[PDB]
Each structure stands twice: as C-alpha cells, then as structure tokens.
Design a binder for this molecule. Structure first.
Ligand code: CL
Ligand code: CL
Length: 162
C-alpha cells in the first residue's frame, strides 16, 4: 500500500464532473474544481486545468495526471507549513501517509487547525490522538473515511485499507 493507492480508495475515480460530499464540483480522483454553484464555472476550471476543451469529461490518463499533481502539492504544502511540517517530520512512513490524506481532503488550513491532535501525534500518544481526531466535523461528516485515517494514525499499519 502507498499514498496513491490509499487515496484512490478513499476518493474513487470519476471521469465526468460530479459533486463531492460537500456538494462541490469535482472530477477525477477527488480533484476539487470550484466551490462555486455554477457548472459553467466548473467546466471553465476544468478546461483550464487540462489544457483543452473537455466538455466536462476527461480521460483516465488526464485524471491520473491531476492526481499526481495534487499529491505532490499536498506534500509540498505540508513541508512549507510551520504547523504541519514538524508533525510530519516526526512521524513514520505509514502515519505520514495518513497526514497527507487529511491534507488532500481538507487543505492545509483545515488540517493546521487540528492543533491539539497534531501535538498529540508529535508526542506519539496514539490512542489519545485518535480520540481527539474523532471530535471534529470531519469525523461526523465522513465517518467511514475518517475512521480509516484514524486507525492508520493509531496503529501505524495499513490494516484499515486491507
Ligand atoms: Cl490544477
Ligand atoms: Cl465516509
């Protein structure tokens, strides 16, 4: 298992514009296009992202390219973030994957707000951090995926994804 396979499981793959769990226009492997309520605005963001007139449909290869770019940006965003970097640095390879997943889903700002859980993670208090992570809108809105990510942080294994 790896970050790519993990996120692919969590986000799925869709080749036509769709609405995410929050009602935002998305495509591919969890690539948010816009928070705007307009499909045209979404189609415009899509063409610009792909470099062509898509008509809201993309190919698998194009979905994967957006995916690669998004994972790279997530990692890069973590490394440039003063609140995130330290946590990330302190973790093992499996748990780092859990943190990238959260950043991929909620953005660097969102994650940077989990001040207390981050601290517990840096201290390596696995069970306590898991309880604290669960007390969030994040867990209440997408409980199954949140449970998978939490289990990953708790155990340091990929068991939740196997
Ligand atoms: Cl983009
Ligand atoms: Cl879920």
């Amino acid at each position: 298992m790896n970050i790519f396979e993990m996120l692919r499981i969590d986000e799925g793959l869709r080749l036509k514009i769709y609405k995410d769990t929050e009602g935002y226009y998305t495509i591919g492997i969890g690539h948010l296009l816009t928070k705007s309520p307009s499909l045209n605005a979404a189609k415009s963001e899509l063409d610009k992202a792909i470099g062509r007139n898509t008509n809201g449909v993309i190919t698998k290869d194009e979905a994967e390219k957006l995916f690669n770019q998004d994972v790279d940006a997530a990692v890069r965003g973590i490394l440039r973030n003063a609140k995130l970097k330290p946590a990330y640095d302190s973790l093992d390879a499996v748990r780092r994957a859990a943190l990238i997943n959260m950043v991929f889903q909620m953005g660097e700002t969102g994650v940077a707000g989990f001040t207390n859980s981050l601290r517990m993670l840096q201290q390596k208090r696995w069970d306590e951090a898991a309880v604290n992570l669960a007390k969030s809108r994040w867990y209440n809105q997408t409980p199954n995926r949140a449970k998978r990510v939490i289990t990953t942080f708790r155990t340091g294994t990929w068991d939740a994804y196997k």
